[PDB]
Design a protein around this ligand. Structure first.
Ligand SMILES: O=P(O)(O)C(Nc1ccc(Cc2ccccc2)cc1)P(=O)(O)O
Length: 299
């Protein structure tokens, strides 16, 4: 069955703990051997959103768990659109998106995890980090001068930054994710993997659409010039922070409907392992219900 074929492909996207990573070679930005049509993918994606909605309702109602979903990607990979698609299927009461911008002055007076810790989901809730704590081994690794504005980083000069520094943040991040995973949080992390070619095509398409044009600010393409350093930082990150307990998935991003299908599928699969059910109505509660109803009929 197609779904079964989809389910098998999905497992190839999970980053194994003791695996090495080459994003050019070991992971696709688009997939040729798609086991379904686009119109089928849209159908299935819609079933996924409804299932996720049922899960969210059960989670809010009864569950002893929280859920944290992380999105990282290069610009124009489809990250915001994906977040938005997932989100509008869900109850706003139980879901919270946090897009972490450049740190505030206050946030810069705490360690780099603090603001992420502060924003964690409460039990019964779903938190989505659109960008995350991982920016601290990505954008700040490509742009290590940013560490000089970090009063907690202990970096007065970029020569001080080396591989041990990054290893040490990887260990911090893992410890953090392990702690929350051992205290009720399900952690799931998605890297939307767009090709340099497709990013260009999307950038040009945005530049030529007058409806979207006004959102461009000076230097929005700067990160594309550091494509290779980002690739490197992503590779090293993915090889050292995917655990069985807090896995990374590398999602091909060059076809958006498919990217969305995959993420919805993985989230459903993973949260289905919690065996969430609605509360059931005991005899005592049943009695109360029938008593309440009799009072209304008798007014
Ligand atoms: O989903 P939408 O909101 O319609 C699009 N978002 C978007 C974000 C930033 C910009 C400014 C910009 C950035 C780089 C190159 C040229 C222009 C334009 C549009 P999209 O994510 O679908 O592209």
């Amino acid at each position: 069955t197609d779904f079964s074929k989809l389910s098998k492909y999905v497992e190839t996207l999970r980053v194994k703990p003791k695996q090495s990573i080459d994003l050019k070679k070991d992971f696709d930005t688009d997939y040729d051997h798609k086991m379904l049509t686009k119109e089928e993918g849209e159908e299935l994606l819609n079933l996924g959103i409804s299932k996720l909605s049922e899960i969210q309702e059960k989670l809010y109602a009864s569950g002893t768990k929280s859920v944290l979903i992380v999105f990282q990607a290069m610009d124009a990979a489809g990250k915001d659109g994906t977040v938005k698609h997932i989100m509008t299927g869900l109850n706003p009461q139980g879901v919270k998106v946090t897009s972490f911008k450049v740190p505030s002055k206050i946030e810069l007076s705490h360690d780099y995890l603090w603001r992420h810790y502060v924003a964690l989901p409460a039990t019964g809730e779903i938190g989505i980090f659109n960008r995350s704590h991982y920016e601290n081994v990505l954008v700040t690794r490509v742009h290590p001068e940013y560490l000089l504005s970090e009063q907690t980083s202990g970096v007065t000069a970029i020569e001080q930054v080396n591989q041990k520094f990054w290893d040490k943040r990887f260990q911090q991040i893992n410890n953090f994710e392990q702690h929350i995973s051992e205290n009720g949080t399900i952690v799931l992390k998605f890297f939307l993997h767009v090709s340099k070619k497709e990013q260009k095509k999307r950038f040009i398409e945005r530049i030529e659409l007058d409806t979207k044009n006004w959102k461009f600010s000076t230097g929005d393409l700067k990160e594309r010039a550091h494509w290779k350093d980002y690739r490197n930082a992503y590779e090293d990150m993915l090889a050292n922070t995917s655990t069985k307990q807090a896995p990374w998935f590398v999602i091909p991003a060059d076809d958006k409907w498919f990217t969305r299908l995959l993420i919805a599928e993985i989230i459903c699969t993973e949260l289905e392992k919690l065996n969430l059910t609605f509360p059931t109505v005991s005899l005592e509660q049943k009695a109360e219900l029938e008593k309440a109803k009799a009072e209304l009929v008798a007014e």
